[PDB]
Design a protein around this motif. Structure first.
Motif, PDB file in Angstrom:
ATOM      1  N   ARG A  53       0.930  -1.242   0.078  1.00  0.00           N
ATOM      2  CA  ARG A  53      -0.150   0.153  -0.126  1.00  0.00           C
ATOM      3  C   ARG A  53       0.869   1.386  -0.101  1.00  0.00           C
ATOM      4  O   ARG A  53       2.084   1.166   0.688  1.00  0.00           O
ATOM      5  CB  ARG A  53      -1.044  -0.306   0.981  1.00  0.00           C
ATOM      6  N   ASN A  54       0.389   2.325  -0.556  1.00  0.00           N
ATOM      7  CA  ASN A  54       0.732   3.451  -0.832  1.00  0.00           C
ATOM      8  C   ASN A  54       0.263   4.591  -0.390  1.00  0.00           C
ATOM      9  O   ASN A  54      -0.203   5.297  -1.247  1.00  0.00           O
ATOM     10  CB  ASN A  54       1.998   3.595  -1.954  1.00  0.00           C
ATOM     11  N   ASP A  55      -1.020   4.603   0.690  1.00  0.00           N
ATOM     12  CA  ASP A  55      -2.118   5.968   0.419  1.00  0.00           C
ATOM     13  C   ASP A  55      -2.123   6.195   2.205  1.00  0.00           C
ATOM     14  O   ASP A  55      -1.915   5.851   2.731  1.00  0.00           O
ATOM     15  CB  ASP A  55      -3.190   4.935   0.265  1.00  0.00           C
ATOM     16  N   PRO A  56      -2.705   7.906   1.660  1.00  0.00           N
ATOM     17  CA  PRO A  56      -3.024   8.675   2.976  1.00  0.00           C
ATOM     18  C   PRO A  56      -4.259   7.967   3.765  1.00  0.00           C
ATOM     19  O   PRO A  56      -4.622   6.474   3.447  1.00  0.00           O
ATOM     20  CB  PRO A  56      -3.961   9.439   2.289  1.00  0.00           C
ATOM     21  N   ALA A  57      -3.946   8.026   5.063  1.00  0.00           N
ATOM     22  CA  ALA A  57      -4.589   7.349   5.839  1.00  0.00           C
ATOM     23  C   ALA A  57      -5.584   8.391   6.577  1.00  0.00           C
ATOM     24  O   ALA A  57      -4.714   8.642   7.556  1.00  0.00           O
ATOM     25  CB  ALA A  57      -4.836   5.328   6.197  1.00  0.00           C
ATOM     26  N   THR A  58      -6.732   7.539   7.759  1.00  0.00           N
ATOM     27  CA  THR A  58      -6.811   8.595   8.864  1.00  0.00           C
ATOM     28  C   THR A  58      -7.258   7.895   9.974  1.00  0.00           C
ATOM     29  O   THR A  58      -7.161   6.568   9.952  1.00  0.00           O
ATOM     30  CB  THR A  58      -8.479   8.521   8.540  1.00  0.00           C
ATOM     31  N   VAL A  59      -6.090   8.253  11.022  1.00  0.00           N
ATOM     32  CA  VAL A  59      -6.307   7.983  12.452  1.00  0.00           C
ATOM     33  C   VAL A  59      -7.736   7.868  13.177  1.00  0.00           C
ATOM     34  O   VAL A  59      -8.267   9.206  13.357  1.00  0.00           O
ATOM     35  CB  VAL A  59      -5.057   8.472  13.190  1.00  0.00           C
ATOM     36  N   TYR A  60      -7.987   7.230  14.128  1.00  0.00           N
ATOM     37  CA  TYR A  60      -9.411   7.533  15.199  1.00  0.00           C
ATOM     38  C   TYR A  60      -8.857   6.742  16.595  1.00  0.00           C
ATOM     39  O   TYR A  60      -7.810   5.738  16.873  1.00  0.00           O
ATOM     40  CB  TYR A  60     -10.127   6.583  14.732  1.00  0.00           C
ATOM     41  N   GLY A  61      -9.050   7.739  17.430  1.00  0.00           N
ATOM     42  CA  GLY A  61      -9.080   6.784  18.702  1.00  0.00           C
ATOM     43  C   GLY A  61      -7.963   7.695  19.594  1.00  0.00           C
ATOM     44  O   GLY A  61      -8.093   8.665  19.502  1.00  0.00           O
ATOM     45  N   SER A  62      -6.492   7.287  20.114  1.00  0.00           N
ATOM     46  CA  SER A  62      -5.909   8.127  20.936  1.00  0.00           C
ATOM     47  C   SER A  62      -4.499   7.412  21.421  1.00  0.00           C
ATOM     48  O   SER A  62      -4.827   6.183  20.796  1.00  0.00           O
ATOM     49  CB  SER A  62      -6.248   8.265  22.398  1.00  0.00           C
ATOM     50  N   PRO A  63      -3.476   7.721  20.961  1.00  0.00           N
ATOM     51  CA  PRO A  63      -2.086   7.501  21.497  1.00  0.00           C
ATOM     52  C   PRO A  63      -2.137   5.995  22.078  1.00  0.00           C
ATOM     53  O   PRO A  63      -2.879   5.976  23.453  1.00  0.00           O
ATOM     54  CB  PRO A  63      -1.545   8.450  22.513  1.00  0.00           C
TER      55      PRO A  63
END
Length: 96
Positions: A53-63
């Motif tokens: 893969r080589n795609d922008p991604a979105t993060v949900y949650g916390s560290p």
């Protein structure tokens, strides 16, 4: 992005070991985006094509307690190990 969420065999098997149920993943995603990242997974970890893969991604949650989702494919790139207090966030994650 909830109906489009794709959890591969690899992620499925890690869920119980890392403290995530499918409902947990959905609930965390439902709390809204909390950061951005990049899905740069290697071939071996991108089923069923295994081409990487080589795609922008979105993060949900916390560290330490997060879910990363590929913006193009809707695939779950990674789920952190919530049972590991020493979990180091992936280097591509940019918290908002």
């Amino acid at each position: 992005k909830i109906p489009g969420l794709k959890i591969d065999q690899k992620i499925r098997g890690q869920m119980p070991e890392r403290g995530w149920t499918e409902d947990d993943i959905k609930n965390t995603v439902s709390n809204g985006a909390t950061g951005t990242s990049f899905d740069k997974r290697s071939p071996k970890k991108t089923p069923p094509d295994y081409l990487g893969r080589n795609d922008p991604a979105t993060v949900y949650g916390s560290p330490g307690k997060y879910v990363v989702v590929n913006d193009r494919t809707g695939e779950v790139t990674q789920i952190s190990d919530k049972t590991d207090p020493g979990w180091v966030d992936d280097s591509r994650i940019q918290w908002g």
